Subunit: 231 residues, 6 copies
């Protein structure tokens, strides 16, 4: 693997995928034990540790379909990763997505061309692994963590003069981020299991920025849900 | 409503949507009491009855995005229908998909241009109402009905020399049908709840067909699950 | 054939194709003799009878490219049908299309993706069989039935928020319907002969709905023209 | 008119449109009396004369959609030309298309993006003026000139490694040329009457070429038919 | 070669490509010696002569991607031409392109479908031969001829209701013409060397037409630069 | 600037843009004096120092169009950066491309949809600032550093089953990377100067890899050339 400098067995079967390598660090150091950093290439830190005994990895993906695709492919093809769970944030684009909501994406729209490259005239609809999603949902409900299940939009252009998010909101899409289409497509293509869990970093359409206290409570809830999404 | 010859009231808040108006007839007569036909326009029959103190309607949609779009639109816009649940068949495209599996579609791919017409360069991924999906799942588990949750492909062309079934199957898609993309897109667009439940009518790739005994059994399973999808 | 429950030789070489299976019934019972219903699958009635001795069939197609494609393919591949003539209605989109005009389509624009699925970057222009069209034209002129020859638009979305009919009208397109692209494409692909004859059910752009007396006179004229379109 | 150096009046209401300005010269000198050259801009010659008390013009168009679009636009917009009739050659792509057949194009497919640029997700099918087509047909029958009526393909690329000639031929398309789509689109757009009449210059697939004797004969046939297309 | 009536060795290794065959004449007669016309087909004159001893050809291309593609392909495939240099004009679309500027195109945007025909979802960016461009630049600078190096837009529709030139200007595109994409694509595809040199015939966006004195001085400068662009 | 944690002033007018923030670190520490880190957000390090009385900055971009677009946008919009110069690696796709060649990109192709999203039916060709390209060329020649000038391909997918590398190579494209299209598009759009300088990290087709010795040598060459691109 060209972008991960790790050996056999150093990466667990289950990998959390924050976008930010500094969040991978924070997650590993805060939630796991027996932490080893297995990757330093390009500063895209990957870590491996244990949670209640179980080997878990946490790997930064960087931003956008192309960056996450690199890491997901190597993780899957060279380290045989079976469960891939994005933990990151999105801009909410609907009023009924609350700042405290943990979002589970069932599927993801995109303006990436990756699927049209593969399918031409077909619209490929990526799809979360249902078992992972059902576990994550039940984990939230059992504790009373508020959870919303729906779809997201995977954007190529964080800054997009030709954005269609008002239309997307109207069709029921919950928020915008920059990875999920890739995660879900590449995972299912190789018989692996994918899910994205998201918290709300802002409300793109109305203006309202969240507060530090909100984001950090929900981030905690997200990770806790994640740590229970594999049975 | 150009294609439904019914007056408001006559159609329930929850509508089952088989492709075949003769299946709509079957479902109503077999599962409901106090059954009335509210539509004969174009032979596309619809019926209303009760199932245990709940008014339910059953409406033939015809085959294909354009045909289902017509009925769904008019049900939504003219009759204020809130829950819309496709009950139909698909051609299975994966071996791991069994002839007894009731399929619950989370999303669907398509070669229909309906969404590119609306979104251009965006791949829009339609999305089941999770609430309906989860109830249908829990109902199937309660009875021990086997169930598979994943994605389907909505085809414009039952006979397609340029089909990409093999690529879709390699990407995890469970089966082929002709309605789901439109159902989920139109329902979400108007804040309504949609779910597709499908039985296996054949295995597309292996050619292997499914007996009558298996079909009727799974059909029964699908309807009974469907009648349990609204909370 | 999965959607037509008929045996060998039960379907004639020449088939009329109304969209509405109840119009197939009306046509068969009103214009033909020795009528047998050969199909009841999905309520999509097909009939076979004689007109001045000659075996003629009439088969409902349902609405939209996908539905008609199913029936045209089975009719052609399993029953060896040689002449396929759509008889239905359209919404007129030009002022000079009069309520009494029988429209013969030379070709058809579309927002269906079926041809882009097959041809990619090519715009496939479907084309009527000229011999059938010339016969239908001469039949109308010999009696003095008013006839207009031009093109139509084959729409996927009867309800389309992104319709381009004002632009299409300007380019000379006569009306909107939901079948012709399919009929013409599939027919010529298999060396068979296709034509669509259309009457005006309304004027989409200006508002004016026709009258029952108009539609029924012109419908009669359409069928009469059809019954003379095969030499 | 940037590319036609003529003053209003000088160009007839009916214009023949060969690709080759030297053919335009030939046609004028051979078939018309009182012949004047009205344009030398860019060597793209045009001529006006009379044929039996009717003023007719003959204008070279050059090769390809962009070139013909230039001349057609300026003829329509600057000189109020009402009838525009391409007389040219095509590469035959079906065996059933004979070296002696005069081809009358009802419509044309294309890999030109000219219509997608205007219509996006709509496949626009251009359409001959039926009145002209029918007169040309009746004129050919009167003389016993063999004639084929159907569709052609308008190519941007005479030499195309990515050609789809075989698929087009299987779909009934008669031959390849480089003008028709633009002629018919632009003429219909401005309420003008267009027709393309084509001779066979070669058989594209079988490689088999057409003698001079056959070419000149069919050419004669095409011009004589053309001079009979306006009522 | 179907469109060039020339024998072996009659065409030089270096060919200038004006759009206008009458400019090919003017160029050959004005700048070269020992001039022979090798082509008269379709009036698209090609000439061959000497400049300070060196064999140079000048060949009219006609207008648009399809026309120039024909000539470039034949020149390359049948006459083994190695250096192809377009000399023509463009409409300037940016204020800082002055009437006296000789434009050298590094690359070219287009609304032609030729590259999408070949590459589908890929945007192919055509590219000038750097050696030819560097020579042409140095030739201009050594004499003090003002030169601007950037990109152009290769248009299919000289008359385009759907033009995007305001957007293109904003992205830095210098001017509009109708050939360069073709020249550059076809050349590099066959390992040959391409460049387009352009003068400003007008300012498309602001209105200002140049003067005859301007155009003719700059045209001279263009040809002089061209005659030094091959080492 | 959501992703750069710097205050105005801190970032130079000229910025080098490696993909790897650890390369950004290397470049700064090795080539500049008085080095300060101005950004640690997301581990995407940036640095400013001086090289011979000139303030220069070095900013990691991450991998892929979406990631570089983020940093480039914020550098342009929030820090008024005028010169932006990618220094990175590519997979060579032509044998004539040597392991020692420093590549200067004139333009780039892409399978990113970023430009179709903005332009629809137009293929937008991005363009290096010639002034920067020419200085980089002249600097390389001065030292005798081998250099190749041509086009690259910007890929969304490092691992792409549907790659068209062979076709691109046949069309003259020099190598594959993941940034250039966005750099050149965004820089030109805001009147800024962009150039990409690339070293060969591998030969994509022949599989043949490049030693450390060769890599470090060419890397040195690239940086030294880069530091000479602003006049
Ligand atoms: N525009 C945007 N795109 C992607 N992720 C985001 N998070 C917040 N705003 C975003
Ligand atoms: N094999 C098949 N192909 C397409 N649509 C279908 N619906 C059911 N079976 C199908
Ligand atoms: N919008 C429409 N689409 C198709 N057929 C029609 N007939 C009348 N209106 C129509
Ligand atoms: N073979 C051919 N290919 C493309 N255009 C043509 N025009 C005439 N013959 C042709
Ligand atoms: N619109 C245009 N297209 C191409 N070349 C041109 N030269 C001047 N105006 C032009
Ligand atoms: N082989 C390759 N494919 C894609 N992007 C690359 N960047 C560097 N090498 C590459």
């Amino acid at each position: 693997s060209v972008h991960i400098g790790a050996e056999k067995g150093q990466i667990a079967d289950t990998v959390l995928l924050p976008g930010d390598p500094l969040r991978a660090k924070f997650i590993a150091e805060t939630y796991l034990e027996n932490v080893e950093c297995y990757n330093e290439v390009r500063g895209m830190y990957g870590f491996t540790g244990t949670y209640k005994g179980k080997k878990i990895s946490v790997q930064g993906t960087g931003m956008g379909v192309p960056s996450i695709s690199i890491y997901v492919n190597e993780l899957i093809q060279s380290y045989d990763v079976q469960n891939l769970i994005r933990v990151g944030s999105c801009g909410a684009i609907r009023k009924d997505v609350k700042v405290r909501d943990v979002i589970l994406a069932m599927t993801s729209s995109t303006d990436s061309q990756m699927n049209r490259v593969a399918f031409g005239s077909v619209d490929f609809a990526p799809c979360a692994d249902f078992e992972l999603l059902k576990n994550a949902y039940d984990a939230a409900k059992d504790k009373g963590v508020p959870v919303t299940v729906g779809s997201v939009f995977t954007a190529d252009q964080f800054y997009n003069d030709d954005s269609q998010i008002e239309k997307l909101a109207k069709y029921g899409v919950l928020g915008v981020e920059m990875e999920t289409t890739a995660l879900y497509t590449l995972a299912a293509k190789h018989g692996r299991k994918a899910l994205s869990i998201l918290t709300v970093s802002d409300h793109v359409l109305t203006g309202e920025e969240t507060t530090a206290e909100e984001r950090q409570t929900t981030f905690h809830d997200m990770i806790d849900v994640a740590l229970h999404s594999v049975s």
